[PDB]
Design a protein around this ligand. Structure first.
Ligand SMILES: NCCCC[C@H](N)C(=O)NS(=O)(=O)OC[C@H]1O[C@@H](n2cnc3c(N)ncnc32)[C@H](O)[C@@H]1O
Ligand SMILES: NCCCC[C@H](N)C(=O)NS(=O)(=O)OC[C@H]1O[C@@H](n2cnc3c(N)ncnc32)[C@H](O)[C@@H]1O
Lengths: 502, 506
């Protein structure tokens, strides 16, 4: 048995000699007549022993096995597109005996080859192609083995070659995105692109990446959300806009966070958050039914040997109000919602966290304590899709104030399998109120909150030209893909996930 | 009145409405019908008609406010790219007192809701005759006067929302942008391509010759580069056995702004196993000609290289596209023979090209590499003569370190660029898939980078290891979406087709 580095060195020398001899081991064009998939669909009815001499076809793929059965006969296990096809290299059937001997000497497991041959089926019932001629298209210079998660992510190409289920997760991911586009296109939304480099990042509470433009001699930030730009287009008269695109957040990596991820955001003039709850139910349950075939999905959050959950996407989804549900979950009344700005509320919330052992790193502000208490006591009860509604204004600096509950806003988040999938609200369109909330945010930054929003004057000026009553919405695409591919790790649904180095 | 005085006065008026509970920013106005549907449904009304039995709620932005005595006032209501006249009549309003109150309250630019009955003026103008108008969002700033409009480009580009409010041709350019992207997805989906997303933050940037943006990740404690192209990720997926992939997405290049460059821009890149670049010329001809025809109704498009006040040109997208070879057309344009193409990597050839650029007054800032000198000469002598869609083919290897060597012309590659209306649109080639020859070209590129070439590629060892597992013979393609939007909207400035283009600050 040879050694993988010794093998690489021998196979490199062999391919070099092919070059110096003029054997052209990286040819320019091979014309494929038919895919492997259609070859199987056309010919897998044949009878054992058959050999259709009147049909000549060219296929191509990757050798996954080379098994010899004699001096005149060699079997190649050809793979591609998710399927297999046996090449039955028989000397009698080949272009010549001299050329037959030579091509079989050349080929190894892993090479890309083109086969020109006839359909057939072995005595043992295996569908095959019987070649007149095989062409080496691209030799594989390394030894092919994949279970350990680290190698699959650093070398996704090996993962795709060896693990058929991986291609399917990314087909599902592609179907998610394509469904969303045609859902919103049908509603009249315009698909738009807005800057990913901003003088001032905003649209979310997140830590941004910073970079530098040499010619303009200015710092820029990668966007954390396109929200501010979308609301400026609504001011401009484009009543329905959406964007599926990459966001960037300088935050830690875990099972549901990657530093670059994909969201869909859309904005709808003359709608409120109640309208968006209906659209969300309709879109999300529709997507799940279209992709999986049912409203029910089985999710394994601790891998396959762990506990199974049945998540039920039948609309209408359950709704819970944040502050009232938290009171029921803690067993104690909280301050009146108009007192959430005060230091007494902050300390009251602080004490509750201490008593209930809910950790919260500094700064221990009212908004961050409430977040920690929600995740601990509410979010973990959201197995099926659940709307969590009416967030305190102090957590929602871009959301319009609630119609009848002072201190709250017209906001919702959708949770599925205890994880946040959507964030939405009636948009704050009062520019003076928006400017006050920015000033609060910039104070929360000066007082230790790495993720608090910057003041965006240019955005406040836009609101001064008149933003119609509007409602916007954001969905984390990667996370949806997780829950439709039974992946408990976001790295399963990212082709090349962010990794620590060597 | 002064524009700043107007802003101060209107802010104070609106603030007094809040303090008096007049709610100038109401939560919900339930619209019954869009303006577009209203226009279609009641365009069949006869002149002078006034439906007494149809009451509808619409909304929009007041574009103009014209009084006609104290009992009648017309509002020109805009939205969705269309216009609807509100014929506000005191006799039909909620009351004559409410009529005075709302007309004095409202100004040009306000967002209003309108509840009323369809009608048509004696002059034949489709109207709505309101029972009640509601302010939904006041416009606090004085809008550019209805006379001289909004024409100054600096203002349009910095306040794109203002541009959109006042210039309907702007909305049309971005509708055309959307259709371009949607057509490409349909074309490529139908051919079986899988739409993919590959990383925009890279340990090292690759896939192009460009200067990158650098950034930093705190938790992982490393520098990252914003991507200059997705190319290397795509070719690794073809090694992985996904024979057809594509991606329409942002690229980032830390280079100067001009009429055809923005620091961030959008490309479609696709890779197709078992194809070469001749196959991609046919595909490009079909996609692009079909795109123009489907979107504009014609294969002929009008082109003004010098603005609307100047010469108009008809540009024909009917395939086949003209095909020329780079080196020979360059030699033609110069009137002078360049060195044999197997000599394009020598220093003596770089010297000759440098001498020529000096002589022809083609500027090239340092580093004056063969590729950059060649790129400048092409831009000066060939790009300007590509009006109709044109394939420029068979670039020398030294400009194409990821492109496969030409199967019969030593020193050249199997590459083409599509040029339309004096602009580069596409870049494509048969993909280099010999990993030993790809490492060599990486090494030369690193040497140049040591000698201070901001744009030279890094040695990507992970990519080279990938090629050693076997990349099938493949062909790949990159198209500038912004650049297609330019030529399909007769725009000579890329800022016309980016919603928020990068600008130097105030
Ligand atoms: N005006 C309405 C608000 C719309 C969306 C708002 N601008 C916004 O960005 N909200 S968000 O909640 O911060 O992000 C949207 C979704 O992105 C997802 N998300 C957030 N951070 C990450 C990370 N880091 N990785 C993956 N997915 C993520 C998650 O599902 C969120 O619900
Ligand atoms: N293997 C095939 C190569 C495919 C494309 C290759 N990876 C690449 O990046 N080529 S490129 O020419 O550098 O860019 C592709 C297109 O992007 C467009 N482009 C390039 N720079 C800019 C800038 N700065 N702004 C706008 N558009 C731009 C232009 O249409 C180019 O043809």
């Amino acid at each position: 048995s040879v050694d993988p580095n010794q093998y690489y060195k021998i196979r490199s020398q062999a391919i070099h000699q092919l070059k110096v001899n003029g054997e052209d081991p990286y040819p320019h064009k091979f014309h494929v007549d038919i895919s492997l998939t259609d070859f199987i669909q056309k010919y897998s009815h044949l009878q054992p022993g058959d050999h259709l001499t009147d049909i000549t076809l060219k296929v191509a793929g990757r050798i996954h096995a080379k098994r010899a059965s004699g001096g005149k006969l060699i079997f190649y296990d050809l793979r591609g597109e998710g399927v297999k096809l046996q090449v039955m290299a028989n000397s009698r059937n080949y272009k010549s005996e001299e050329e037959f001997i030579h091509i079989n000497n050349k080929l190894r497991r892993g090479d890309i080859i083109g086969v020109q041959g006839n359909p057939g089926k072995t005595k043992k019932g295996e569908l095959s192609i019987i070649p007149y001629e095989i062409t080496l298209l691209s030799p594989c210079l390394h030894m092919l083995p994949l279970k350990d998660k680290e190698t699959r992510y650093r070398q996704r190409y090996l993962d795709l070659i060896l693990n058929d289920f991986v291609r399917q997760k990314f087909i599902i991911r592609s179907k998610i995105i394509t469904y969303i586009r045609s859902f919103l296109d049908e509603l009249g939304f315009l698909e738009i692109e807005t800057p990913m480099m901003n003088i001032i990042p905003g649209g979310a509470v997140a830590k941004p990446f910073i970079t530098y433009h040499n010619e303009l001699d200015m710092n820029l930030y990668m966007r954390i959300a396109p929200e501010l730009y979308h609301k400026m287009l609504v001011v401009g008269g484009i009543d329905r806009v959406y964007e599926i695109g990459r966001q960037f957040r300088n935050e830690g990596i875990d099972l549901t966070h990657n530093p670059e991820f994909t969201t869909c955001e859309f904005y709808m003039a003359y709608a409120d958050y109640h309208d968006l709850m209906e659209i969300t139910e309709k879109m999300v349950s529709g997507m799940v039914k279209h992709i999986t075939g049912s409203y029910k999905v089985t999710y394994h959050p601790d891998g396959p040997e762990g506990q199974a959950y049945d998540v039920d996407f039948t609309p209408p989804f359950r709704r819970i109000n944040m502050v009232e549900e938290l009171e029921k979950a803690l067993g104690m009344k909280l301050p009146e919602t108009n007192l959430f700005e005060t230091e007494e509320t902050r300390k009251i919330l602080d004490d509750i966290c201490v008593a209930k052992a809910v950790e919260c790193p500094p700064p221990r502000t009212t908004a961050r304590l409430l977040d920690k208490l929600v995740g601990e006591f509410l979010e973990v009860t959201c197995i099926n899709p659940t709307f969590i509604c009416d967030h305190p204004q102090i957590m929602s600096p871009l959301a319009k104030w609630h119609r009848s509950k002072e201190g709250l806003t017209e906001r919702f988040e959708l949770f599925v399998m205890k994880k946040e999938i959507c964030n939405a609200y009636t948009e704050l369109n009062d520019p003076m109120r928006q400017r006050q909330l920015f000033e609060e945010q910039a104070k929360a930054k000066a007082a230790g909150d790495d993720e608090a929003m910057f003041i965006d004057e240019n955005f406040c000026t836009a609101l001064e030209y008149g933003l119609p009553p509007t409602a916007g919405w954001g969905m984390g695409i990667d996370r949806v893909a997780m829950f439709l591919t039974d992946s408990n790790n976001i790295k399963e649904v990212l082709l090349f996930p962010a990794m620590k180095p060597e």
